[PDB]
Amino acid sequence: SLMRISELYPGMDPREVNVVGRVLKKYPPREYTRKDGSVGRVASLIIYDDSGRARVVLWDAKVSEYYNKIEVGDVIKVLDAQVKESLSGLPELHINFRARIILNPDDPRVEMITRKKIKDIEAGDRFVEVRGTIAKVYRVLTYDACPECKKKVDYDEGLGVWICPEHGEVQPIKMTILDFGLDDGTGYIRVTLFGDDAEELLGVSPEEIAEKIKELEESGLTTKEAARKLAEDEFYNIIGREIVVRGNVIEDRFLGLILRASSWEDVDYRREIERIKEELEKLGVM
Amino acid sequence: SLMRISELYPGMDPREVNVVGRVLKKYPPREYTRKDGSVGRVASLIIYDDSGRARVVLWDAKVSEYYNKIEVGDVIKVLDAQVKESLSGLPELHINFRARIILNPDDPRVEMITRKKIKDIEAGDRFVEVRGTIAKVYRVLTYDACPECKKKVDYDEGLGVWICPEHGEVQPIKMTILDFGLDDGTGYIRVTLFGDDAEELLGVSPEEIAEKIKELEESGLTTKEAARKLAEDEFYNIIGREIVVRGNVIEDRFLGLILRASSWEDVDYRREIERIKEELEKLGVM
Amino acid sequence: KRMPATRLYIKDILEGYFVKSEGDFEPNYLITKYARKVYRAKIVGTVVREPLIAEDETYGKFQVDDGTGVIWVLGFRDDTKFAKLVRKGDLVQVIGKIAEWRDDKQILVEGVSKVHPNMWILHRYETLKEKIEHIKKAKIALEIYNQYGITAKSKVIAKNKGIEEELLEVIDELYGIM
Amino acid sequence: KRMPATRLYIKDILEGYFVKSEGDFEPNYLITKYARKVYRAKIVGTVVREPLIAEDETYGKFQVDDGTGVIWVLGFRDDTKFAKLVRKGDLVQVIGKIAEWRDDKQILVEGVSKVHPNMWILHRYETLKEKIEHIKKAKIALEIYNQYGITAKSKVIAKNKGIEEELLEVIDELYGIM
Amino acid sequence: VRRRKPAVERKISEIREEDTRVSLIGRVIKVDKMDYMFWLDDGTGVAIIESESDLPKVGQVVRVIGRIIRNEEGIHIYAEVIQDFSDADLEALEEIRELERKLLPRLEGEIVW
Amino acid sequence: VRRRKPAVERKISEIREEDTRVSLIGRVIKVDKMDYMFWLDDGTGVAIIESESDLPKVGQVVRVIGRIIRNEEGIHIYAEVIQDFSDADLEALEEIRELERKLLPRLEGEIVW
DNA sequence: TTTTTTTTTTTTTTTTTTTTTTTTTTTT
Ligand SMILES: [Zn+2]
Ligand SMILES: [Zn+2]
């Protein structure tokens, strides 16, 4: 079939339903109550093809039959499913007794859908784990963010409300930004932490940081100047600390490689010593 | 003595052997080769009393001493002979240095001269073939056995050696014991398999079973407790399997009928279907 | 004693009349439509769905289809191990105690193992043979019951015709149920 | 660019040859006895004395001992804050620029923080691993330098054996110093 | 309460309109590894079996339990269970199918309470 | 110019006569809160540690850096630094001490200019 | 031909802010 997800519509003939999609998301299986009082199972996934996305809902025995067999990145082919309108007005694929799923199908539409040393890191690197020393603190600041998309919100003086360009009138949350450098003995890389991860490393609340930023701005400093000053004056104590950062490396058009850290954690010393023992064995020490 | 030929059994005390018989057959004397390379003589006769027949084997000087003195129709009395099992499973009287024969004795005895359903099985049944389902697993264990008689060997801590009561200092072999139940639709019977037959059915080496028994015993279980536990925890997979067992039925004074299986084999489905077709023809189906 | 596991069609188990013994030690049994008293069942079918193991490992179950019916097979506590053995699509032979839950008959797994396709054929042949044997014996026993009932005279007549005394009691019990 | 901080024993820093860059913007560096060019140092030791803060807060300093040597760590002006962080007895990790004052090598503090005793163990393991790695590479590079010197042919041979071109220049510079 | 309908044993040529779940036994003659479909020949006909994950080999004797799919392209079987029937005595199976066909209705009709 | 002598890492049983400042790692077995002294056991011996101000707890694993005091009463350590080594992997520390003992003299001796 | 001995049974389940990287020298 040439059918695409964009062509699905609620109530279309299940006999016409023939789409493929790569799995983007898998949600946990849930229980639901039937009209007769019994309890069934239901599980949802999000798939996408070259045209759009669809929620795929596995019902009852279809959960046991397929749910554990499917993983993110896999492609599935869906046949004979009922199409329903989602709560947002979009088509969803319901996998009931009649429906079938083919895991990693042979279909022409399919083609159309780690510890690394800093010296080896490249631009665009994904899922990189780097263990090193905090060497520099560039900036510490907090901004008002949307609680859903975490993007910067704008204060409207005419209406007295906070406006998110994606979600409209929202209640803002304080988001912490920590920019620092990390050294592993073979290289140096810039690192950025956000919100809860940054607050955990800094050991200071975002509301307290906002108050200190306000005091600096009142003195005649801009937001840029106040952020650099607070990092040097109050958060210099964090320098010299050995940590493990995990994230993706983006290349700034002048700042160079910046590691956007998704998480940070304390060094597992026994794990690190075992890595060193492996290297020593390779050198003919042990 | 009142002893009859029907009462002889292999390995009975030669001092108890006292039978009379009329000579039915005399075979020619033969030569045989001794372990030392020399050549001896041996001659056989068939005798019978009011109870049954026995082969009488005259060895070496007993041939010269008695063979020509005996004739068909004469009665002989046999004393102090060794009793052996013939090639057909029947008692034979061996007339060696110790044994004696009295020609035409003065004795009061002289004037007097398979496939079975479990529901049909009796105590003491021999060569019974039963096809059924493995229904229960009682015990799985291994013991140190003598490589000759296959009996349990004792470890002597004073000498550091393994002692067989029949063969003395021996090198022990691990013997597997499998106790289970078998059901044929008309009855239920307990079954016991030994060594190679049991290992073949279990699909695990006796050395591996010994290791698992040791782990269970170390935890505070006795040999009896560990054997029942290993059967339930690891060998429960064997239950539900259809097999053909052949053996003799012994009656335990509390456990009931136990089928000591000499061998086990996979079901020949075409042979079984032919048996069923015979039964259907008897019912007026075909 | 330990009575036999009767080889039957799943349909015969499903259409039967389960009998709960009031005693805490008495075994439960089923009486089929052809007056067959069954304590244990022996069936051969295909596992139609991937097994169901409760997250808390308190129970494990799997479904068996033989062509004449579909039945659930259950193992509780550590007996959940039986359900873990099988997988969707396996052709298996099951032995166990008949149970009734929510007025639906089921099999409390005693043993489950994969079988060769010729075993399924052998099972069908045996099931039919036993069924014919039983029906003909029960037909003669029913005539004895309708003429004399459960008397000392009818028990002697039943033994002479190759019928077990227990068969007349099963007929009487089935008449009481119906 | 920003070059790496090399993990070393204090002894290796102390016994090294400090090189003052003549340019007002060029970074100073040290060449160890094993021909290792070091721009920044990363050491793990114990603060042996209560820090020294000048009354006028122009400088702050503290002493670090790692078992192989004892070195001073200095912070000037507002950088005096680094010395105020530590106390006598703290087990710390220090990163900074190597400096030479009164012909004695020292560390110009860039960062100092308290570490877990297992970090001191990890530091010793890493320091030894890196040292062996470097010595073996420098031994092969020294043979290349003694046979060919700094030529286009020797640079190709060095790349083939996993040796950086910079290493041959360090050997030549060290020979010039000695 | 839609209880699982047992698989009705049929030959490819004897499939009925009212049949929703069937059991077929045959030999694989063609396997399409891209559309996950295979051609099963039992001696009485050829059925197109659409499989979700298990694809047999060409020339393999298999037993298929599946739901019947009736569309404009024809009647295809969406395979639920595919079993290896390579060593199965189909001669014996055919003989027991005929015995059940003849004797089962007579046995049920013998009940005169 | 009496430059500070680095603390020489030793075991209690391996302390030498020429040693003036040492680093010992052990478990506290007794604390005298009046004479400010404590008993340190490393597995190889017991040393009497005289402390000026910091007294550890009984059963605490500690690292002591101190000057050796040799008098008529014996050899006691005047503690300079006492660190909490309670979560320290002494097995790993022992292994690195042996690696340094074997490899450090060989690395220095490889220099053939 | 073998080890060691007490047979079986009921019931339990649902992706972000905002953007110009690094560097020397100063010490009671
Ligand atoms: Zn938003
Ligand atoms: Zn023996």
Author numbering:
A (entry chain D), B (entry chain A): 62 to 174, 186 to 358
C (entry chain B), D (entry chain H): 3 to 180
E (entry chain C), F (entry chain I): 5 to 117
What text comes from the article?
Replication Protein A (RPA) is a heterotrimeric single stranded DNA-binding protein with essential roles in DNA replication, recombination and repair. In Archaea, the same function is also fulfilled by a heterotrimeric RPA. We report three crystal structures and five cryo-EM structures of Pyrococcus abyssi RPA (hereafter referred to PabRPA), in its apo form as well as bound to ssDNA. We find that archaeal and eukaryotic RPAs share a conserved heterotrimerization core, which is composed of three OB domains connected through a three-helix bundle formed by a C-terminal α-helix from each subunit.
We also collected two independent cryo-EM SPA (single-particle analysis) datasets showing multiple PabRPAs coating the ssDNA by using a poly-dT100 oligonucleotide. Interestingly, 2D class averages reveal that PabRPA dimers adopt two different conformations in the two datasets. In the second dataset, PabRPA-ssDNA complexes are more condensed, adopting a pseudo-helicoidal configuration. 2D class averages show additional density for OB-1 that connects two Tri-Cs from adjacent RPAs. Both 3D reconstructions show that two PabRPA molecules interact with each other on ssDNA through the OB-1 domain of one PabRPA that packs against the Tri-C of an adjacent PabRPA protomer particularly with its OB-4 domain. While their OB-1 domains are similarly oriented in both types of oligomeric forms, the OB-1 domain is more loosely packed to the adjacent Tri-C in the relaxed form than in the condensed one. Differences between the two DNA-bound PabRPA oligomeric forms are due to a rotation around the OB-1/OB-2 domains of the Rpa1 subunit. In the condensed PabRPA filament, this rotation brings RPA protomers closer together, compared to their position in the relaxed linear filaments observed in PabRPA and SceRPA17. Importantly, in both types of filaments, the DNA-binding groove of OB-1 is ideally located to route the ssDNA from an RPA to the other, and protect the DNA from nucleases. In P. abyssi, we observed two forms of ssDNA-RPA assemblies: a relaxed mode with PabRPA molecules arranged in tandem, and a condensed mode with RPA molecules forming a helical-like structure.
